[PDB]
């Protein structure tokens, strides 16, 4: 599934980031890093979900979870 985040996609991300030349080992690393990131946020998002006695992860559960990691996001119910 983590290979769904494809090489060309990571390149587009890196380009918005301002990157000209990308070493071939970068594509695995980024996949590792995104997994760690997504894990941490989803862990917390799901914690909030469970606590509300729900079975559905909401936009707010995510917003709350990103607020906890110190990564406030605007546009989804902030």
């Amino acid at each position: 599934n983590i290979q769904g985040i494809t090489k060309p996609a990571i390149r587009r991300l890196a380009r918005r980031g301002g990157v000209k030349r990308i070493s071939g080992l970068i594509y695995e690393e980024t996949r590792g890093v995104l997994k760690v990131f997504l894990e941490n946020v989803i862990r917390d998002a799901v914690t909030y979900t469970e606590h509300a006695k729900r079975k559905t992860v909401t936009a707010m559960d995510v917003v709350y979870a990103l607020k906890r990691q110190g990564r406030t996001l605007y546009g989804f119910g902030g």
């Binding site: 918005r16 980031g17 998002a45 559905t56 992860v57 996001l73």
Partner: peptide, 22 residues
């Protein structure tokens, strides 16, 4: 299950993160 917007939230957050990291 997931509200459609929640996956959306996670993708905005994920990409902003990665872009900032590059």
């Amino acid at each position: 299950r997931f509200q459609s917007s929640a996956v959306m939230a996670l993708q905005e957050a994920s990409e902003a993160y990665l872009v900032a990291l590059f």
